[model samples]
Target: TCPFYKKIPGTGFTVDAFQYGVVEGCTAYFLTHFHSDHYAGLSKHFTFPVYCSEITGNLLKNKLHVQEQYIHPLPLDTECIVNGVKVVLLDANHCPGAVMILFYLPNGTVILHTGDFRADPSMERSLLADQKVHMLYLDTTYCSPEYTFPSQQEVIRFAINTAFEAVTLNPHALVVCGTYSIGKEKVFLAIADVLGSKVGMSQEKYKTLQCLNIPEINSLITTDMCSSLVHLLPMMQINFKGLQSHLKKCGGKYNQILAFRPTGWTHSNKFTRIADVIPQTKGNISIYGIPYSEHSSYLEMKRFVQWLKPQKIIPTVNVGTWKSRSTMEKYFREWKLEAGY
Candidate 1:
């Protein structure tokens, strides 16, 4: 039952003991990202000192609502001490608030944890320019032949084309593109440039973009604050009446709606049940479903692990399951077996 650790008490043999006792004794617990899977244990058993990148820290504080008492926000690429352990946070391009952590253990073990990363060859240069990594905890989510996604630029082009087509088709249709709070920034930029209108952004979105210090793509950002392009403000209501009114004013000018969602969608149906609740527009409403995924594909995952040449590869998530677990094991065996423990 693996209860020996618990029964052994002072020996620190239990699973919980390792976390609460041994792990707690370490300088700190470095969280690589704010994804649910990575942060699941934070509010529960983990109360040890924690450190993360500024973006990750903000996300955990504002988005996840993690207790401030448990967090220590660290800047990217800066070396710092937590619970006496030396650590560094590096950018992980998977998400806006994601980080890749490097831990310098007291035992001279330098470990790298690439939390949900895509193969951005630039990342190799970034990390290599900083320090050498010994062991690595790899993210193998896409380590199969079936996974593939177009490049970021390609996806951006698709989004731009989609917006252009929508406007050209029907000048009077009220358009709404649904996307993630963070990911749709590119789509919005594209739409703004093509429409020759300012991008409509909420106050909250404006603050986030400001914090990120994104250079103004263009001056065409229209908010209610800017009366000159008030017409560009997207109707924020959930019902069709707003769309109908907007469409009428556009005079057959198609209002383009762009939405990029992750998961819970299928080939036949692009939107979830909640989409039905949105108000319908009188003009032709076309929805474009482009595969814009941040996660690496199976080939990319394998390539990442092989490139790092880590000493050990541990698979988690669906560890003992049939499909995912088997795939993880297969990839590790093929690429990491040489140095793997």
Candidate 2:
């Protein structure tokens, strides 16, 4: 079963929280990222010591107003001993400051909690080289084979081209790119670099980007909505129905509206799913859902598991019921058979 809080057997270390409730006798907590779902039960009054990346710690302190005394920042790829457990943080390649946590248990077993990550070459080189993983807590968001999208690089290129093409076709359309507050900084920065213009963002996103201190990102972010042809809006603002409502509210602020959403669901087998640069138009609004996800596809997940060959696999998300768990088990069984393992 996929409980919200995963406790190490015979240890006080618990990963994340369940319904804002901490496990009794839990000595320490490890956070993978700042995603709301992952950190669901966290609050400003949290008293336990929490360990995570420096960027995540900053977000907890600045954004959530958590006390600095309780936040412990773990540098990437470095090992630290806490309560007799050796822990190493590896880059997750999902979002900024996201990480996969490797725990060296006292009983000589290694537990890997891949918080939310995509399969990349660097991860294999840095963490999977000759390492023995006993248990793998996987991010199986796209565990089904229907989610075979292109690489992030290809998706970014497609988004940039599609955005430009929309403007070319409409001429007077205002390009709006949908992104999360933390993730998809690459998309906004890339669009700005290609278009040779600054991109507007909300103050919250601008502040978060400023903390990252990347020259490419710092140079392109702006708070003024009219500063550039491309505007950076929250991901929720550019959904299908949301786009329609937004366009209606605009009431001719611009001649037309063109929006892009970068996500893995774009390629799923659903009638509403958008797989490629193909744009669906409604009135003056042309929206395209690009496959620019940070999670690994089914193929990538299969390859990753084959490489690690962990003794047991524990899915991190969507395993609440027996039916869900059975589905996940079936997927893994088929994946192993396909791999000839």
Candidate 3:
């Protein structure tokens, strides 16, 4: 039932299996990140050795309670051998400790699995080096041409600016930024640094951030919401029910509440561009959907494919869909033309 799980025949390795599809008899396991979708089945009961980034490894131990001995931390830019395969981890630019795994097989074949990453100009040189990629497992989260969003830096600037403007308009208002537990730690730190304020987070989030051990992040986290001008709430908790729970206690102290969600879904259509800042307000709360995302947009994917020039492409999601094959081919053709390859 789980089509996303993949295995290399001679290598005896498995990649990103949810609990339902845990690999049996596989020699080794590789995890790309701590996202729930990528790490569904993992728990204390996991018996196999898991290879992942240091950040992801810590999360598995602290959050999922996986035993420390079974977790192997793969530092970025270093090459290591796992089950006879030369493995290297590259920054995925998705979330904290997220990585793209590169495998060099004994048979001289190279495979790259982009574990949910946004295209960064800085990564182009290293990724496009003089290596032939036999197969590329792509993150096709935004494969369609309709999804165009700006870089994470641009979106962060916009989000932080929006928060400042909101606070200026209503001096007594509390600005809450919505984010996932692990992915958007930078957003909180950015806001805190620019606004010169501490960011309030749940105990769980604070612990996860502590594991990250980033000095800038450590200084920004707080358990008391009232201690900070901006509160960083889990992205899922920014909805009606979630908001009501938080507001129930702090609602009386503030005259207004402003919420901002830095996500790519806000501009899924051709109408909304990266520069656009649109806010959906409900009563005293205003939620802005900033076009911030970690996955590559259609154009970015096209360029990435063109530069890497993998002999074959495989979509990491929706593998069995009828449209998947044609869409990938179309992207390759367009990329080839633009890249002069």
Candidate 4:
């Protein structure tokens, strides 16, 4: 077992390592985002200095109720000294409050840790443009050619268009969109605007968004779920059975329900073509399978790594199999080696 307690080797810094506590010689702890998996091991009793984006810091306090004293909410695209280590945080673009941690180790080694990134093209300008990266801990979620998917804007439009059609046909059809605690804000918020409907979410969801300081949507949101036709739901409860329970609480607001399940991994692609959402139904409920992913496409990752031309690359996701990671490296070689052309 590799164990999730990962550390930035030789830097005495544990990165996304709260799941299992810090290792010996560790001086600082960094969180890439506020997702539960990355922040698993942290608790109220854990009193360690943790650094992350300012928005992520707010989430730590609201979701986990962790003591505020231990949190270090850093600003984006800025450098800060942490225990003699030059650390910088860049917008990850993977999820809200997510950042790619840059550690300028005192040993003249530079390490870039992409917590979970969407491979946004703006990184080139945002990434210190001409700075040479020594080591890149890449987000290899779709490292293989078989895993490419559509872009965020492409899928966002699809979701909005699909929802617009679904709602346009049956105005009373209860519409719900699935999402994680943080990411995918673009998909749902737009649908609410395009449809001229307020996004309904529970008080708990409202608190988290409010903590995000999303005053832009404050006028477009509601805590009373029954007041709005569109509702936001956790990704887990976006299924037919889940909607059935939800319908029970609607005071018989409507008979049929439609859901927009947005995710990039749902349908794989190869960049040559785009796939339309496959609409499926189960009695009074139907779900749209959207290829809306937040991770980088296979080609994007290759192009990204080649442009950075890091001296060394370490795969962050799916590094379990040596053969798998090793195979992925071959493509990396072609990208970086042939980059001169």
Candidate 5:
């Protein structure tokens, strides 16, 4: 089955379906995270009640300036009843405060909505162990075979080592990483711990970091631009011209740039290591498109589907085209082709 749209069937709840101004017939609006694509049409003037993770609710209040009364923050691994449906939130390993929404309907049916997650083996033990899921709303962000990159830990370790070597090779060559509003903090934080790199960011980002509750993040920060060689910038600012402007900010402190850009875009099964996957060399700026993603790869998706064994699976991404969604469904059928206890 294909869940091309955001609104869930037979319920008044909509999960990350805020793109339209007002979704009719939907009573409760559920947001997975504060990412731009997910929280798109949510505004300060929105009148509907919203349910999401505690961190997502905090961001909804702080970032979007939404009223507190309209926001409902649910704790992880807990059972909540909204509109007579048993709702639960599982820790989704994506951005901070990201959670997978699970619905237990009164008619003896279950639905699992994976809101952009990175799956692991432990998920079979605690996350979705017992219940017989009737339907699954899965995150198929990286569903194709070509998007089969390594796990998050492996990619992060590669990024940390790459950052360390780049800085060590040339002390003045600055390290700039492309990141989003909430995700990709593991790379830079681990880099700081390993390389003793003083991280730099905007004031707003510093406040967001405070919300993340990282233990040693405060000590690795620096206000002075010249004192910090490792700077965290937006994903848009990691290109040639962007890094050039960053290089100008330091007042001649650094001569060249070694940047680590996004993953999942330049991914290929042709290469094993992330360092060998993607790169480009300019006059003074070098970009390494590391495969550092928070989404599950093809194999992980297969494993999740095989383990969950849901009666019906609905893809939540890349559903615009018939071909793309069908290809993912083909993989799904193959994954469930065999029955082994």
Candidate 6:
């Protein structure tokens, strides 16, 4: 058996898939975050158990509804031994329940794998206090120059402002937003902040917010499940029909409506199916297309690698190596040709 794993031909070895093999020889697989791209493959390949931050594990089991037998909760900043490798989980501020994993090897090499992260104000201070890393397997999904996502606070403010402005603009119309159910909790919380105390959200929405751990960024009325209130107007939904029609009939009102969709190359390339859906809104509808994203930008990725200064950088998701040639040449000087893609 091979002590170190290598990618096979034609099966498409994603970064996570290669990491899965690495976990097989080791004690445990460290799930850096709960995002499907990073952790989902582990369920099929590595039956050897997984480790993640507590909130991440809870979100995986409770929010994403992953199976329990596959998960092992490790609190943030705690050192743990998994299959002989020393590991620690750090807060990754991309999402509420996301984490960055640090792996300490026997040969004194430390690797920091940032699954999907953003430079949040809170994370910067915490990183300064932690032990410096060596190799950094960074998030390269947004390696292009155009991949710029707004900060969590900025998204919150913009969503709230848009909602409130829409409310004032159309007093009779119900403002609804379409967003991913579990991923866009921050956007939902922004709506909660604006609706605070006065906005009557539906029972379903209240439950959704409760499960998402909507923090007290501002004063908002919430229930304890034992007793809850149902608000009908000015609601948020994940589906387009519910957003545009269902709530409108209830004499519900929305100020400004916000909806989430793809952007950049993804909006044009892979998401070609929905590309023709013209972002224009009719009647009391206005659609704002903000470049809100989940992946790290190129600058962030570069900064991450520079900070960690890994001995060898291996990028796993190479279709032919031709596509990544320019990017690889631009930054990764330590890249060694392990094998052909």
The candidate that wins on lDDT is: 5
Alpha-carbon lDDT, every model: 0.54, 0.77, 0.77, 0.80, 0.80, 0.51
* Tens digit per residue, CA lDDT, model 2, 1-341: 22543766667777766344757877888888888887876778998899889888888888888898899998998879988778899999888889998988888888889999898756678856867888888998887777677777777777678667666777567778887657777877787677777888778877777766466665677887666767877888885677666556444666787787776665343443233346778767777767677888887888889777777888987777788788889987776677665
- The residue-level lDDT of candidate 3 at 96 comes to 81
Candidate 5 colliding pairs, count: 0
User: Is 3 or 6 the stronger prediction by lDDT?
Assistant: 3
What TM-score would each prediction reach against the true structure? 0.69, 0.88, 0.91, 0.92, 0.92, 0.69
Error of 4 at 210 (Å): 1.9
- Going through the candidates in order, what is the number of backbone clashes in each? 31, 0, 1, 3, 0, 11
In terms of lDDT, the poorest run of 10 residues in model 5 is: 263-272
Writing each residue's lDDT as its tens digit, candidate 1 over 1-341 gives 22221221122111112223444224445566655545544553345556676766666566556677877788787787655567677777776767776767777767676766676766767754555566666666656665656566766776666556666775533334444345335655665577666655566655554434356633645444333221333324323455455445544434453332222123333233222322233334333445556677666666666666666665433454688777677768876665463
lDDT of 1 at 186: 62
Better of 1 and 4 by TM-score: 4
Model 4 residue pairs with clashes: 263-292, 264-292, 264-293
Residue 121 lDDT in candidate 6: 40
Question: Which residue pairs in model 3 clash with each other?
Answer: 19-41
Best by TM-score: 4
Cand. 1 TM to true fold: 0.69
Candidate 2 overall lDDT versus native: 0.77
**Candidate 2, residue 246: CA error in Å?**
6.1
Clashing pairs for model 2 are: none
RMSD, model 2, all Cα superposed? 3.1
